[PDB]
Amino acid sequence: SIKIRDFGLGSDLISLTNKAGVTISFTNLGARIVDWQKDGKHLILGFDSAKEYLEKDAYPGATVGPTAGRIKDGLVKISGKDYILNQNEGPQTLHGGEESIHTKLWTYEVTDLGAEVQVKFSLVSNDGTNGYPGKIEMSVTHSFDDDNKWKIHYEAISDKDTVFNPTGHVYFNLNGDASESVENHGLRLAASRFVPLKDQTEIVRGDIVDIKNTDLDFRQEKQLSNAFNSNMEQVQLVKGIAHPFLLDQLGLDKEQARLTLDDTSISVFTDQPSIVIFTANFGDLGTLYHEKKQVHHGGITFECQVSPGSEQIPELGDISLKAGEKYQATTIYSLHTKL
C-alpha cells in the first residue's frame, strides 16, 4: 500500500508498505528517506516532521549533492578553469554548500508497479547555484519492492560542463533506538584500502592506504567495537570512522557491505567505486530522535559515491560531468531476516 500525508512546511510524507508488511517512507524535502521499519522497529534514524530536520540536522536520509563530501578550499577545475564553490564549512565546500539540494522541496511522482513502487523526485539546479555551472536537471528515484529491496537511482543532465557526484545520507541503527551505540553491530566490507584524512578539517591527507590486517579490515565480518576501540591514529583523529573506503571489485551484482545485528542484516550494492562510512561521532551532542537522546556512535552511514578528495588524488576518479552527458548511478539497500 501507499499513503501520502503532510509532513510539515508543505512537504509530503510518502509511505510504502510492501507485501511483507515492511514500511519505508520518504519525503520530498531533500528526496529523502525518513523511516524504514519492520515489526515496529526502526532500522534507520529519522525525525517525525519536516521542521525537525531543518532545526536539528538536515542531512539524515537525504540526497546530498551536487557533490557529496568535502572539497578543499571549495575549489574545482572545470575544463581547465578554476571554479570556487560555496564554502560552508570553513574554506571547504561540504555536501554542495549551504542551503543545498537536501533543503529543497523536490517535485515527485509515484509509480505503482505492483511488486515494486517507485517515487521519482525531481529538481533543477540552476546554472551558477552555489557556484556550480548548470543548469542540471536531476532526478532521484527511490523504490521499494516486495523483496525488501530499497533502491536509489540517480540521473542527471547538465547544459554545461560541471561536476556531479551525489550520495544518499541514510544512517542505520539496527538497535531501533539512537540512544544505543552501533558498536554491537557486525560489519563486513569488501575494501582493502582507505583514504586517510589530513586532520580534523577532514580534508584528505593525500595518499591511499592499505588496511589489510588493521583494525579497519572488515573484509571478514567483525564487530564495530573493534574499530571503535582501536588506537589507529586515523580512528583516534575522528573518534570513530569518517572515511572513504575503496571497493575492491566494482559492479552492482556484488554485495559490497553488510551490516548485521542478530537475525537482521542489511546488504549494500552499488555501481560506485567507494563507500564513505561515518559512525555518528557526535560525542555529547545528544540530538533527539523520537525523543531518544543520541549517543556517540549512535548510527552509521554507507555513502556510496566516488571518493571525496579526487581534486587532490586523481586516482580516486573523476567527477566531471560534460554538457549533454547523462549521469546515472544506482545504490541498493537490501533487508534480510534470518529464519
Ligand X SMILES: OC[C@H]1O[C@@H](O)[C@H](O)[C@@H](O)[C@@H]1O
320, β-bridge pairs? 163
Q: Which is nearer to Na ion, 9 or 250 (CB)?
A: 9
- The site partner of 202 among Na ion, ligand X, a copy of itself, none (C-beta below 5 to 8 Å per kind) is ligand X
Around Cβ 286, how many Cβ atoms within 10 Å?
14
Q: Nine-digit cell at 84?
A: 570556487
Strand-strand pairing, 288-289 and 320-321: unpaired
Beta carbons of 171 and 197 less than 8 angstroms apart: no
Q: Is 324 in the site for a copy of itself (CB under 8 A)?
A: no
Q: Is 108 in the site for Na ion (CB under 5 A)?
A: no
Around Cβ 314, how many Cβ atoms within 10 Å?
9
Q: Which is nearer to a copy of itself, 99 or 315 (CB)?
A: 99
Selected from 1, 2, 8, 12, the binder of Na ion by CB under 5 A is 12
Q: Is 202 in the site for ligand X (CB under 6 A)?
A: yes
Q: How far apart are CA 110 and CA 27, in angstroms?
A: 12
φ and ψ at 235, to 5 degrees?
-70, -40
Selected from 1, 3, 79, 107, the binder of a copy of itself by CB under 8 A is 107
Element (H, E) at 71: strand 70-71
Q: Is 34 in the site for a copy of itself (CB under 8 A)?
A: no
Q: Is 7 in the site for a copy of itself (CB under 8 A)?
A: no
DSSP state of 69: S
Q: Is 278 in the site for ligand X (CB under 6 A)?
A: yes
Q: How far apart are CA 279 and CA 243, in angstroms?
A: 10
- What order do you get walking across the sheet with 209-210 strand by strand? 209-210, 191-194, 242-247, 274-278, 303-305
Q: Nine-digit cell at 309?
A: 578528495
Question: Which one of 9-17, 70-78, 91-99, 120-128 is the stretch in contact with Na ion (CB under 5 A)?
Answer: 9-17
Q: Report the nearest approach of Na ion to the CB of residue 17 (Å).
A: 19
What burial class does residue 43 get, using C-beta atoms within 10 Å of its C-beta: 0-12 exposed, 13-18 middle, 19+ buried? buried
Question: Which one of 7-15, 192-200, 232-240, 305-313 is the stretch in contact with Na ion (CB under 5 A)?
Answer: 7-15
Selected from 25, 129, 165, 181, the binder of a copy of itself by CB under 8 A is 129
Query: Of 129, 85, 33, whose CA–CA distance to 333 is shortest?
Result: 33
Q: Is 242 in the site for ligand X (CB under 6 A)?
A: yes
Radius of gyration of the chain (CA): 19
Question: Which one of 72-80, 106-114, 243-251, 262-270 is the stretch in contact with a copy of itself (CB under 8 A)?
Answer: 106-114
Question: Which one of 2-10, 182-190, 195-203, 247-255 is the stretch in contact with a copy of itself (CB under 8 A)?
Answer: 2-10
What is the per-residue binding string for ligand X in 155-194, x denoting contact by CB under 6 A?
A: ----------------------------------------
Q: Which is nearer to ligand X, 12 or 202 (CB)?
A: 202
Q: How far apart are CA 275 and CA 310, in angstroms?
A: 14
Of residues 253 through 292, those in contact with Na ion by CB under 5 A are none
Q: Report the nearest approach of a copy of itself to the CB of residue 135 (Å).
A: 6
| Residues found near ligand X in the complex (CB under 6 A) | 59, 202, 242, 278
